[PDB]
Write a protein that binds this ligand. Structure first.
Ligand SMILES: */C=C\C(=O)Nc1cc(Nc2nccc(-c3cn(C)c4ccccc34)n2)c(OC)cc1N(C)CCN(C)C
Length: 319
């Protein structure tokens, strides 16, 4: 009773793009800021380029192709856009460059300029992302502020689909316990509802401006804490209304937790009266710079002339 997935998968020529710089280096993988130019399209598209670092090179190519499979299949303004893959000896995943980086980092660097209206909107855009995933029957299994990226301060998108699964499909090292639901931790169960719990943690990270959840606590302890019924603390800036939503995402009974489409509604409502629900000093006059429009802003980011720059979101196949 599932539809045929007719998404296209595009193969990019290694000649078509250039790596400007290294966004991140990790034992697991390395990512590059770069620029992609389809031959004869007269466009330049800012891109991020990913190569994995598994113990064996074939096993690395397995994990990254699954991720491409997922991204090629989703199309939604709050989910990260795949452009294609490159068949170099180690496979390269090519996606839309998100110039402001991940949310967790962004919220740390700019906490003194981040207002209630921004935070409630990220929370809306995020539930929209996940609810879209729910429609697609996709469980992310690693929702977290490090895996939300910022196209602009007005616009975020979910990312890191490496662990993603279809609901109930058959699938353990360095799992992220802190964001995990209890049923997930005790019985390796995972659901949209399990995702909802992670959304809760994710929201808390934003309301705490990047605080580490269960800071100073060993992962082994966490399952026991949650079993006692302890949870994460109420962030200072958080009215009870908001905190209550977090706490529902952290109920033991998963059917009890809210649904992403319900989260959209609720945070969407508060975004109409933001200072009623988040209390932040100086909230009234905080500005986050968004020089999306300037070509010059682009030129600085990738260090080139940019008259023919195009963001992935305005670049649509058919080619
Ligand atoms: C949370 C770290 C981070 O994302 N930093 C970051 C990210 C970007 N833009 C971007 N755009 C698309 C994809 C990625 C991306 C995906 N994955 C798995 C990554 C791993 C490591 C790094 C980036 C990844 N990133 C960016 O664009 C300018 C800058 C940036 N920063 C701020 C680099 C410094 N951070 C590590 C703090």
């Amino acid at each position: 009773g599932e539809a045929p997935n007719q998404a296209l998968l595009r193969i990019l020529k290694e000649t078509e793009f250039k790596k400007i710089k290294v966004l991140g280096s990790g034992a697991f993988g390395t990512v590059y800021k770069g620029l992609w130019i389809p031959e004869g399209e007269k466009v330049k598209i800012p891109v991020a380029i990913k190569e994995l670092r598994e113990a064996t090179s074939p096993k690395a190519n397995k994990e990254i192709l699954d991720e491409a499979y997922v991204m090629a299949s989703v199309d939604n303004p709050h989910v990260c856009r795949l452009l294609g893959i490159c068949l170099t000896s180690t496979v390269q995943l090519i996606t839309q460059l998100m110039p402001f980086g991940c949310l967790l980092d962004y919220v740390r660097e700019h906490k003194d300029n981040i207002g209630s209206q921004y935070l409630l909107n990220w929370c809306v855009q995020i539930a929209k992302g996940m609810n879209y995933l729910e429609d697609r029957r996709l469980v992310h299994r690693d929702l977290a502020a490090r895996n939300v990226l910022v196209k602009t301060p007005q616009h975020v998108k979910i990312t890191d689909f490496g662990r993603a699964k279809l609901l109930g499909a058959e699938e353990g090292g360095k799992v992220p316990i802190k964001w995990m639901a209890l049923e997930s931790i005790l019985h390796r169960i995972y659901t949209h509802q399990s995702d909802v719990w992670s959304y809760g943690v994710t929201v808390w990270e934003l309301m705490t401006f990047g605080s580490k959840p269960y800071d100073g606590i060993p992962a082994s302890e966490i399952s026991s804490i949650l079993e006692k019924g302890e949870r994460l603390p109420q962030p200072p800036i958080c009215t009870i209304d908001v905190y209550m939503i977090m706490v529902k995402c952290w109920m033991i009974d998963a059917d009890s937790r809210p649904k992403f489409r319900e989260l959209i509604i609720e945070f969407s409502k508060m975004a109409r009266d933001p200072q009623r629900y988040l209390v932040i000093q100086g909230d009234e006059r905080m500005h986050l710079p968004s020089p999306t429009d300037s070509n010059f802003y682009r030129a600085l980011m990738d260090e080139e002339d940019m008259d023919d720059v195009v963001d992935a979101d305005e670049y649509l196949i058919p080619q």
